[PDB]
Amino acid sequence: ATKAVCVLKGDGPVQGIINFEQKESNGPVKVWGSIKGLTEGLHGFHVHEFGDNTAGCTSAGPHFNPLSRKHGGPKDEERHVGDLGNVTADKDGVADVSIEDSVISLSGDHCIIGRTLVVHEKADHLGTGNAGSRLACGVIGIAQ
Amino acid sequence: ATKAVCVLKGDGPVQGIINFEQKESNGPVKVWGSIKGLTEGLHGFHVHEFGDNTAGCTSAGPHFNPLSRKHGGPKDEERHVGDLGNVTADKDGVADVSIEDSVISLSGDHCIIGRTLVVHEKADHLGKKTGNAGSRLACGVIGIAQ
Ligand SMILES: [Zn+2]
Ligand SMILES: [Zn+2]
Ligand SMILES: [Zn+2]
Ligand SMILES: [Zn+2]
């Protein structure tokens, strides 16, 4: 069981914490936490390739795409590893997140440790995905 | 991984950017950048185990020590993987960093990506369990760079 965590921050009101837990080698990755200050509705949710916050979320590069596949949704075969779809903010601007994903990993080639988790301005249209600006982001770190 | 980067921030004026480059996976790592807002003199410089900044620098946990060694300085053989010694800030509070280390790595079981780089209030005593370098002034998670 490996664990990771990400503190999402940006230049506006969006902020939150997302936890990752992988009980087994190459096993499903639980992803859960809360993001607040969002506009009500859907927000694109992506792992971007670089854990580089030197230029804020802009330096995070493109979607984590180690397999040079096309963009899609977490249910799509043809997707980027970093394609986690959308989070939904409630009427109070809070997106309580709880999913499971089998394409990301906390080990090996699909590993997301050291990359950047990003929450977006708009919905991902899921097949990039036209989710608009990168509102908050953080480097995915190893957690106890 | 051949390059990594870390943005150091805290609650005070200390801030900086540190870059890592490792040409060969079994070779040394070059570490370079600049930290500003420091008091003049030596400041402990460590990789802590967890890349968890949910509680700022405190949640980074202890020195990264996957090889079960005792605390030392970077040129000691008895050291933690995270023991990068001290950075030195000049009279303007600026610590220019440019070193090479052969214990940290950007891959494998000495890998420091996804862990926390920390700069401290005062000097690491280099072994003469933590080095007594005082509070954690700034930190960041070490991320994969292009
Ligand atoms: Zn994105
Ligand atoms: Zn994508
Ligand atoms: Zn320390
Ligand atoms: Zn140590």
UniProtKB/Swiss-Prot annotation, chain A:
It is an enzyme of class 1 (oxidoreductase). Changing residue 57 to A: Exhibits very slow copper acquisition. Its cofactor is Cu cation; Zn(2+). The ditryptophan cross-link at Trp-32 is responsible for the non-disulfide-linked homodimerization. Such modification might only occur in extreme conditions and additional experimental evidence is required. Palmitoylation helps nuclear targeting and decreases catalytic activity. One of its GO terms (cellular component) is extracellular space. Changing residue 122 to E: Mimicks constitutive succinylation state; decreased activity. The keyword Nucleus applies. The modification N6-acetyllysine is found at residue 122. Changing residue 93 to A: In ALS1; increases tendency to form fibrillar aggregates; ubiquitinated by RNF19A; ubiquitinated by MARCHF5. Zn(2+) binds at residues 63, 71, 80, 83. It holds the Pfam family Sod_Cu. It is found in: Cytoplasm; Nucleus. Changing residue 37 to R: In ALS1; mild form; ubiquitinated by RNF19A. Ubiquitinated by MARCHF5; leading to the degradation of mitochondrial SOD1. Disulfide bonds join 57-137. It catalyses: 2 superoxide + 2 H(+) = H2O2 + O2. It comes from the Eukaryota. The modification N6-succinyllysine is found at residues 3, 9, 91, 122. GO terms for molecular function: copper ion binding; identical protein binding; protein homodimerization activity; protein phosphatase 2B binding; protein-folding chaperone binding; small GTPase binding; superoxide dismutase activity; zinc ion binding. Keywords: Acetylation, Amyotrophic lateral sclerosis, Antioxidant, Copper, Cytoplasm, Disease variant, Disulfide bond, Lipoprotein, Metal-binding, Neurodegeneration, Nucleus, Oxidoreductase, Palmitate, Phosphoprotein, Ubl conjugation, Zinc. Destroys radicals which are normally produced within the cells and which are toxic to biological systems. Belongs to the Cu-Zn superoxide dismutase family. The protein (both wild-type and ALS1 variants) has a tendency to form fibrillar aggregates in the absence of the intramolecular disulfide bond or of bound zinc ions. These aggregates may have cytotoxic effects. Zinc binding promotes dimerization and stabilizes the native form. Homodimer; non-disulfide-linked. Homodimerization may take place via the ditryptophan cross-link at Trp-32. Heterodimer with SOD1. The heterodimer CCS:SOD1 interacts with SLC31A1; this heterotrimer is Cu(1+)-mediated and its maintenance is regulated through SOD1 activation. Interacts with DAOA; the interaction is direct. This is Superoxide dismutase [Cu-Zn]. It comes from Homo sapiens.
